[PDB]
Amino acid sequence: EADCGLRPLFEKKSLEDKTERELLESYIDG
Amino acid sequence: AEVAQPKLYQRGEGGNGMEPIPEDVLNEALN
Amino acid sequence: IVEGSDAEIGMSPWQVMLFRKSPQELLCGASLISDRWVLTAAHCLLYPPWDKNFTENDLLVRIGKHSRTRYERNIEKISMLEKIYIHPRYNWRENLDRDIALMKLKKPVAFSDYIHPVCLPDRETAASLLQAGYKGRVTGWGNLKETWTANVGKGQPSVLQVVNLPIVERPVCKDSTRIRITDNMFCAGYKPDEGKRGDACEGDSGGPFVMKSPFNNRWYQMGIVSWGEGCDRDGKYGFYTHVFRLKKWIQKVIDQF
Ligand SMILES: *[C@@H]1O[C@H](CO)[C@@H](O)[C@H](O)[C@H]1NC(C)=O
Ligand code: NA
């Protein structure tokens, strides 16, 4: 399904959850 | 050879404090 | 989940609770990958060493849940199972190799703010994301500690728990255990000198290890909580079924049934 992995209450609203920045930061520093 | 142990309850902990699913909800799914 | 925190509402809308009908019990975590297919661990359905064998009529899935214990009116949806598919070369005897199973729902679930499927990785996504040092996310309703004296909190959470954990180099995973590791699993967690802690624990198995693609904003299920030696032990790691390494079987089952 082309809509998988995009959360209605977050990505679809351009909102980030409280800890996902730690995942994205690991791509930079990990 | 050692045996890998799954991260699965073995002593019934899955039932702890578990509230029953209402019968109207259970019967709706069964039909 | 050890050293996690309460999930936010809708934070993991693909999280599924595999539920035993009678007696009413949490069985395992699982994940929604489409409107009618759910991914979990094989040992949730078939584990002969503990005389475990569940078929389709024994279980149901609860989707959109947050509370571990409450029936969440007008939020969660429950579905019966039509068919269970366990990997034909699942190795419960030794190292839980290919610890994966698929469940087809009797009726498709309607998506909502709290119910939405996760993506499965392709070859370049797996090559790109599944690298040591990159962190993924594990969610579950399982134990908060291996033992009681390990901290002052409760044994089980009232609400779905979340923790982020780094993928570990394969030679470090292998040296951490005397169990024979295969290419169909990976391990995640912190080393002692990294200071931070966290792990999946008893009751979390079957749930998803997910990563967010830095290139298209989507969440991909890379792993399934499988096994470990204790929980959050120094020098040990949680082990996960490597989802992409088994995607050919996943696709075979879904395309055929
Ligand atoms: C599991 O149980 C079902 C029915 O409960 C039975 O038909 C099946 O043969 C069992 N599987 C094994 C491996 O014993
Ligand atoms: Na550890």
Author numbering:
A (entry chain L): 6 to 22, 22A, 22B, 22C, 22D, 22E, 22F, 22G, ...
B (entry chain A): 5 to 35
C (entry chain H): 16 to 36, 36A, 37 to 60, 60A, 60B, 60C, 60D, 60E, ...
Publication text:
pmcThrombin is a serine protease that plays a central role in hemostasis, catalyzing the conversion of fibrinogen to fibrin, activating platelets through cleavage of protease-activated receptor-1 (PAR-1) and potentiating its own production through activation of factors V, VIII, and XI. The thrombin catalytic site is composed of the triad His57, Asp102, and Ser195 lying at the bottom of a cleft formed by two extensions in the basic trypsin-like structure known as the 60 loop and the autolysis loop. Thrombin also possesses two positively charged binding sites at other points on its surface, known as the fibrinogen-binding site (exosite I) and the heparin-binding site (exosite II). In this study we investigate the activity of two similar, highly expressed peptides given the names XC-42 (ABM55431.1) and XC-43 (ABM55432.1) that have no obviously conserved domains or overall similarities with other peptides of known function.
The three-dimensional structure of human α-thrombin complexed with XC-43 was determined by X-ray crystallography at a resolution of 2.15 Å using molecular replacement methods with a thrombin search model. The crystal belonged to the orthorhombic space group P212121 with an asymmetric unit containing six thrombin-XC-43 complexes. All six complexes have a similar overall structure (r.m.s.d. = 0.153 ± 0.0085 Å over 260 Cα positions) with high-quality electron density covering the peptide spanning from XC-43 residues XGlu 6 (X superscript indicates XC-43 while T superscript indicates thrombin) to XAsn 35. XC-43 binding buries an interface measuring 1710.5 Å2 (48% of the inhibitor surface area) and as suggested by the alignment described in Figure 1, binds with contact points at the protease active site and at exosite I. In the active site region, the side chain of XLys 11 (P1) is inserted into the S1 pocket and its NZ atom is hydrogen bonded with the side chain of TAsp 189 and the carbonyl oxygen of TGly219 through a network involving two water molecules. The side chain of XLeu 12 (P1ʹ) is situated in the pocket (S1ʹ) bounded by THis 57, TTrp 60D, TLys 60F, TLeu 41, and the TCys 42-Cys59 disulfide bond with the side chain of Lys 60F being pushed toward TPhe 60H by the bulky hydrophobic side chain of XLeu 12. This positions a water molecule (TWat 693) in the vicinity of the P1-P1ʹ peptide bond where it forms a hydrogen bond with the side chain hydroxyl of TSer 195. The serine side chain is rotated approximately 180° relative to its position in most other thrombin/inhibitor complex structures and its hydroxyl group continues to lie within hydrogen bonding distance of NE2 in THis 57 and also forms a hydrogen bond with the carbonyl oxygen atom of XLys 11 of the inhibitor (3.07 Å). The P2ʹ residue of XC-43, XTyr 13, is inserted into the S2ʹ pocket at the base of the autolysis loop where its phenolic hydroxyl is hydrogen bonded with TAsn 143.
